[PDB]
Structure 1
Amino acid sequence: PVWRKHYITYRINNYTPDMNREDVDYAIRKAFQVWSNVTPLKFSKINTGMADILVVFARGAHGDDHAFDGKGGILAHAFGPGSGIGGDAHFDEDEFWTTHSGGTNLFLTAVHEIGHSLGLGHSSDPKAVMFPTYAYVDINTFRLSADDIRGIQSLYG
């Protein structure tokens, strides 16, 4: 499935204590911008009511039958487009979420997870943001790969 509308809302359910709130907000907002910059999708943050994409920070078992695993390993996960838990993006609180160095970069991970929230799978290109393995890349030069663009535009272009 894909989202069958182009105005998509998100809501931050709770904040990781790893980062200042402003920096969580900014990383998430910029991550959505990565995908709206190459599609007709528009994303809006809401602060009450039910959003399409709920952003959650949780550790271990957190009520969706896909428990996290402590620091390392699975860093986050997200559900594909749909009602309810569909679209929601969960970040493992046992990671150390960061803006610049150390830990696991929240912006880069959110770009990957929102990709899943929108319906993308994984890429075989190590340069793709949808590559299955996280690695820190220079955020100043960050750019979707041709494969990422092809994938998202096949769904929403």
Structure 2
Amino acid sequence: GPVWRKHYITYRINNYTPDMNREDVDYAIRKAFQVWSNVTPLKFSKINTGMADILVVFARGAHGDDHAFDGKGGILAHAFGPGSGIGGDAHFDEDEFWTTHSGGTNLFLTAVHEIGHSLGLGHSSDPKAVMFPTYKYVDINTFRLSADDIRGIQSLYG
């Protein structure tokens, strides 16, 4: 599959869920990018204007691609693999309730999974891996990538 062929990667947050404080959205997304840059040569920077490599979008129902969201529950988010235009972009279902904690759906943990996809990773069959297809809350303050996630990303980068 596709990978980014450059080390400096930019992201832009298109719009903000009303479910969270603005600064908490920023920090959750920043922390999620850090998870991946910690184990690759990639460097991530938030830009406030213009075209980013990775556009972060909150939206509900039909929102202009082929991956219509389904209301509360089920699909929480989806992202496109590396590439031009929409490639890399990560979309979060506004019909979920986004949080900093174990309530609703944790934005940080979902963003880690989505960014994995934005970088070229597919799903893992290992239930311990963040790239496993099923959302499961784990304490975010002690979160660590599984060995499976590390081998996956390192197979693509570095």
TM-score class, shorter-chain normalisation, is: over 0.9
- Partner of 1:43, secondary structure, is strand
Deviation, 1:101, is 2.5
Which residue of 2 is the match for residue 80 of structure 1? 81
CA offsets per residue over residues 32-65 of structure 1, 9 Å max, x none? 0000000000000000110000000000000012
Aligned partners of 1:25 and 1:138: how far apart in 2? Answer: 19
% identity of equivalent residues: 99
* TM-score, L = length of structure 1: 0.99
CA offsets per residue over residues 91-129 of structure 1, 9 Å max, x none? 000000000131000000000000000000011111110
CA offsets per residue over residues 123-152 of structure 1, 9 Å max, x none? 111111001000100112211011100010
Deviation, 1:13, is 0.1
Deviating more after overlay: 136-145 vs 45-54: 136-145
Aligned partners of 2:97 and 2:60: how far apart in 1? Answer: 11
Aligned partners of 1:30 and 1:113: how far apart in 2? Answer: 13
* TM-score, L = length of structure 2: 0.98
Structure 1 runs of 4+ off > 2 angstroms?
A: none
- Partner of 1:140, secondary structure, is helix
Aligned partners of 1:76 and 1:126: how far apart in 2? Answer: 18
- Partner of 1:35, secondary structure, is helix
How many residues in Structure 1 have an aligned counterpart in Structure 2? Answer: 157
- Partner of 1:11, secondary structure, is strand
Aligned partners of 1:4 and 1:118: how far apart in 2? Answer: 10
Aligned partners of 1:154 and 1:87: how far apart in 2? Answer: 18
Aligned partners of 2:50 and 2:22: how far apart in 1? Answer: 20
| Unpaired segments ≥5 residues, structure 1 | none
| Unpaired segments ≥5 residues, structure 2 | none
1:93-104 equivalence runs, <5 A: 93-104=94-105
Deviation, 1:66, is 1.1
RMSD of equivalent CA atoms: 0.5
Aligned partners of 1:131 and 1:141: how far apart in 2? Answer: 18
CA offsets per residue over residues 51-97 of structure 1, 9 Å max, x none? 00000000000001210000000000000000000000000000000
Which residue of 2 is the match for residue 112 of structure 1? 113
Which residue of 2 is the match for residue 20 of structure 1? 21
